[PDB]
Amino acid sequence: TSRAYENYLTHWTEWKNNRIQEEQRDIAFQRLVSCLQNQETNLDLSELGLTTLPEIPPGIKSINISKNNLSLISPLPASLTQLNVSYNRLIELPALPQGLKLLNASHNQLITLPTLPISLKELHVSNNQLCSLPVLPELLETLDVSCNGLAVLPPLPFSLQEISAIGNLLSELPPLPHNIHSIWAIDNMLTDIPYLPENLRNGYFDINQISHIPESILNLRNECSIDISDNPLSSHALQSLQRLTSSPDYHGPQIYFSMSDGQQNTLHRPLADAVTAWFPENKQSDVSQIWHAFEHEEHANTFSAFLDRLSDTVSARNTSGFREQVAAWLEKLSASAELRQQSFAVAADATESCEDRVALTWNNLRKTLLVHQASEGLFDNDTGALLSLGREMFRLEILEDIARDKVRTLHFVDEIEVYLAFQTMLAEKLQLSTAVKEMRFYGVSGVTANDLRTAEAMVRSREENEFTDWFSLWGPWHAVLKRTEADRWAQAEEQKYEMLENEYPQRVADRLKASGLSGDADAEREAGAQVMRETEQQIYRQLTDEVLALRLPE
């Protein structure tokens, strides 16, 4: 019994009369009729609360049944294009007609969604329980997925111009087709901004987990507004953006910002915390008791300053949460034996000349440790260990040169997070034990696939001529020398004294003539500095070359 004319008619009457509520059953039956009787292709009968729905006539182009109480839906005409089921609660969605351009189901129940036909140009789903999206016809220019929890946001059509998911639980986004113009996400969890095509007027992300600014944002038109308010951003990133924004000439596309961790952190001297605990957890395992006594201290505040500052980039927890280099170190200061004094005293010069910037400081702590490790006697004549560290430590050294060099091109990135990127990636290439060894894409901005192996090559180079000279001036190396070979160490000064006495002033003169800089009250000083530096390099290379040397038969 495929549909006849009257077949509807009898069945409809049964639908109006059986189970009338106070009114609205039959009123649709008047509507069902006039849409049939006058052949009008579309019908609303949305307002009138109706438990269920009857059969539909074949010639229908649109159906507006919405704002009802309707548990489920009947069979659809193929002929259908516009469908609004919106506000009536719906637990399941029937099979769709090919030619539907417009489609809406909002404020409804179902978790499950079916296959959208090619001709479909529009999809609205506003409040829902669905967590999973099927295939989108490339034809589709509108996606309202907002407000219902979604982890997985599928591919987007070639043709999508609009995307809205608010309140979804999605972790990251797919990259967006060029047509895309307006974008909305709030109350989500979002790694980062996925490249944002230049057509775009407004993307919106208030979803307070995004770590950094893609820096590809400044390619976008003047009245173009995007929103990064309430995201965790480095004091550096925000401050940078702000300075960048208050500008004689135009910011970029107007971007909307936040405030974040209280009151101006990379402007000078705002605050200092105490015994900042990144330690195995908020589990202190006796800590803050132990670092309490130090709280009354001198030089402890300077240290407190670069405890926040170094936290800021890696307190994102990013890469390994805690103990990445974190918890093992401050247990070393816990014993002191001059170590702390050592650590605190270096921490002051972070804010001293070199003025304000970082990353030499973190390097320098590790050096001051070895300086201490070596000194307290940990190298007996075992040089082998001390060989591989210095060689490693040189690599780490050269990389901070590199970060500093890239970080003055990029304004959205702390100097250290650039570095913090290289350390984990090159961890394989260049042997690195001080590598936390793994997190992939937190390797931030800049950091070209190539520039990563443009750096490896670089350090591969300096290692060659420059390293042998490196060890001889290094820290710990001296700390081992004074202990094991005292005489030769001593005779090294005997000789350093000599040059200072003898050729030193002349050595300078010679040097200044060749700079044509003799007048300068300024260059005369870098003259000694170079000579004083050079002969130290000279002296202490002799000193090392001997200490470890192979030539036997005579």
Angstrom distance (rounded) from CA 215 to CA 532: 44
Angstrom distance (rounded) from CA 351 to CA 302: 8
Beta carbons of 386 and 476 less than 8 angstroms apart:
yes
Written as six digits, the tokens of 21 are 């509520």
55 in the Ramachandran plot: left (φ > 0), alpha (ψ -120 to 50) or beta? beta
Cα 509 → chain centroid: 53
Angstrom distance (rounded) from CA 316 to CA 476: 32
How far are the Cα atoms of 274, 303, 423 from residue 308, in angstroms, in the given order?
9, 9, 21
Cα of first residue to Cα of last residue in the chain, in angstroms, is 113
| List of residues 6+ apart from 303 with CB closer than 8 A | 343, 344, 347, 348
R_g of the chain, CA atoms, integer Å: 35
Written as six digits, the tokens of 276 are 């900042």
Three-state DSSP state, 164: strand
Q: Name which of 552, 327, 333 is nearest 436 in CA terms.
A: 327
Beta carbons of 282 and 329 less than 8 angstroms apart:
no
CA atoms within 13 A on the CB side of 27: 11
Beta carbons of 161 and 142 less than 8 angstroms apart:
yes
Q: Name which of 282, 305, 292 is nearest 361 in CA terms.
A: 305
Method used to determine the 3D structure: X-ray
Angstrom distance (rounded) from CA 454 to CA 426: 11
**Could you tell me which residues are beta bridge partners of residue 368?**
none
Q: Name which of 318, 292, 355 is nearest 444 in CA terms.
A: 318
Written as six digits, the tokens of 507 are 């050595």
Using DSSP, how many helices (H) and how many strands (E) does the chain show? 14, 11
Q: What is the resolution of this structure in A?
A: 3.4
How far are the Cα atoms of 29, 37, 46, 315 from residue 3, in angstroms, in the given order?
18, 16, 24, 68
Cα 179 → chain centroid: 26
Beta carbons of 471 and 369 less than 8 angstroms apart:
no
Cα 368 → chain centroid: 31
Domain ranges of the chain: 300-477, 487-547
* Second-level CATH architecture of 300-477: Up-down Bundle (1.20)
Burial class from Cβ neighbours inside 10 Å (0-12, 13-18, 19+) for residue 495 reads middle
Q: Name which of 260, 360, 361 is nearest 302 in CA terms.
A: 361
| List of residues 6+ apart from 54 with CB closer than 8 A | 8, 11, 12, 15, 28, 32, 74
Written as six digits, the tokens of 218 are 């400044």
Q: Is the dihedral of CA 503, 508, 511, 513 positive or negative?
A: negative
Angstrom distance (rounded) from CA 395 to CA 84: 64
Q: What is the DSSP string of 420-484?
A: HHHHHHHHHHTT-SS-----STTS-SS--HHHHHHHHHHHHHHHHHHHHHHHHT-HHHHHHHHHH
Q: Name which of 408, 407, 403, 397 is nearest 422 in CA terms.
A: 403
Angstrom distance (rounded) from CA 112 to CA 528: 78
Cα 153 → chain centroid: 20
**Residues, the chain, total?**
554
Residue 318: count other Cβ atoms within 10 Å of its Cβ: 17
Written as six digits, the tokens of 303 are 């240290």
Active site residue 354: yes
Q: What is the DSSP string of 324-361?
A: SSHHHHHHHHHH-SSHHHHHHHHHHTTTSSS-S--SHH
One-letter amino acid of 127: N
Beta carbons of 185 and 209 less than 8 angstroms apart:
no
148 in the Ramachandran plot: left (φ > 0), alpha (ψ -120 to 50) or beta? beta
Burial class from Cβ neighbours inside 10 Å (0-12, 13-18, 19+) for residue 127 reads middle
Written as six digits, the tokens of 314 are 């890696």
Kindly compute the dihedral angle of the four CA atoms of residues 299, 301, 304, 306, in this order, to the nearest 10 degrees: -70
Angle at alpha carbon of residue 310, lines to 308 and 313, rounded to 5°? 105
